[PDB]
């Protein structure tokens, strides 16, 4: 197409939401100037907004009335800032030469462009591997990501492992101190077809919170071979994004989950969470909070004489003989906030072995003395304790 470059009209709220979407996946704070911009292409009945970061690419497609075809590359953050501050009326965009004319109401903008010649061709999304409701995907990633490592030196822990078998999806992450596992059922396009990949936690966590709405979010991995190489597409609700997977091999995590517990404790999560970080106010360096389990009570304690000492007793439904165990207060509330249930079940063994935090409903469950097996749940947050003073 010809002489008149890209020119289109669409409503502000829709234009702004799509640009705000691509620009948020475009931190792109410094140079090179090719990476700072966002590229707009009109065709057909709609407009496409594109961006790229390192490891993630964002593309948002919105309906717009295209009076003339074309593409243009304009600065990402600025045009997201403009489209949010314009009055609520239609937005007219007309590419004139090396600049773009933007008209909304009585406000007019002329912004410089960059050569579309320089914008990279961004990766293809693989074939759709399946889809799940965005509100489930949002919660499932939110639970597992909190246990993922934030580090660099250890790439293995910084990701979220995705195991796909038929209609069941299992998600896991660990920093070596804590393990989070969520198992869910989704609508799969290849049931049954098996696969396991590992996706960077931070990107997959931000993409999930972004996604909440909403439509069904679709994951694209392979056809498969078979999984596939090398990317994870996340599409749905007008947005689509690719993230390069990680090569590291995730640990085999089901050996770490205990089959039995010598003692178990069930508590109210809201009341325990507030107790922990009240007691932890005097905990030195946020190091540890101590829990003395007896039956019908647990005593939380922390602190040193140099600053202060704290104590609080809570009601517990306890089974087995008394155990005194100490956890990292931050790791501890991270798990409790992740269960998303009214009550919690603690699987215990020894003060030096893993504690298995399990979600429990409001009121269901039934257990005299002997060893108690680990009951199945869709989520598990396994935390290992800290050595006692």
């Amino acid at each position: 197409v010809g002489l008149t470059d890209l020119t289109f009209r669409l409503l502000r709220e829709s234009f702004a939401d799509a640009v705000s979407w691509v620009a948020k996946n475009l931190p792109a704070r410094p140079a090179v100037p090719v990476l700072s911009g966002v590229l707009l292409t009109g065709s057909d009945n709609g407009l496409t907004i594109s961006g790229f970061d390192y490891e993630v690419s964002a593309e948002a497609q919105v309906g717009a009335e295209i009076v003339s075809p074309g593409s243009v590359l304009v600065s990402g953050r600025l045009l997201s800032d403009i489209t949010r501050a314009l009055p609520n009326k239609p937005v007219d965009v007309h590419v004139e030469g090396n600049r773009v004319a933007l008209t909304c109401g009585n406000a007019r903008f002329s912004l410089p462009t960059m050569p579309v010649e320089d914008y990279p061709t961004l990766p293809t999304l693989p074939e759709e591997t399946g889809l799940l409701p965005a509100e489930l995907f949002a919660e499932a990633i939110s639970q597992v990501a909190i246990a993922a490592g934030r580090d660099d030196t250890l790439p293995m822990l910084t990701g979220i492992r995705v195991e796909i078998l038929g209609e069941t999806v299992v998600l896991a992450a660990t920093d070596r101190f804590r393990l989070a596992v969520r198992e869910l059922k989704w609508s799969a396009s290849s049931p049954d077809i098996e696969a396991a990949v590992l996706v960077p936690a931070k990107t997959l966590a931000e993409a999930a919170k972004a996604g909440i709405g909403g439509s069904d979010v679709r994951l694209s991995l392979g056809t498969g071979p078979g999984g596939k190489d090398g990317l994870l597409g996340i599409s749905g609700n007008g947005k689509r994004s690719t993230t390069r997977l990680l090569d590291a091999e995730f640990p085999k995590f089901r050996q770490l989950l205990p089959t039995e517990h010598t003692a178990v404790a069930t508590m109210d999560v809201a009341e325990l969470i507030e107790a922990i970080k009240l007691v932890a106010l005097v905990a030195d360096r946020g190091a540890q909070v101590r829990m003395e389990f007896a039956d019908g009570s647990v005593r939380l304690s922390a602190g040193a004489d140099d600053v202060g000492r704290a104590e609080e007793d809570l009601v517990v439904d306890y089974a087995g003989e008394p155990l005194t165990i100490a956890f990292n207060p931050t790791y501890l509330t991270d798990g409790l906030s992740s269960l998303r249930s009214e009550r919690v079940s603690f699987g215990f063994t020894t003060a030096g072995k893993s504690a298995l935090l399990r979600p429990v409903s409001g009121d269901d469950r039934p257990n005299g003395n002997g060893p108690f097996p680990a009951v199945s749940t869709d989520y598990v947050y396994l935390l290992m304790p800290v050595r006692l003073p």
Binding site: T174, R176, F177, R178, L179, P251, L256, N328, G352, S354, L382, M384, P385, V386, R387
Partner: peptide
């Protein structure tokens, strides 16, 4: 702090 593996 104690480690899983």
């Amino acid at each position: 702090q104690a480690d899983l593996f």
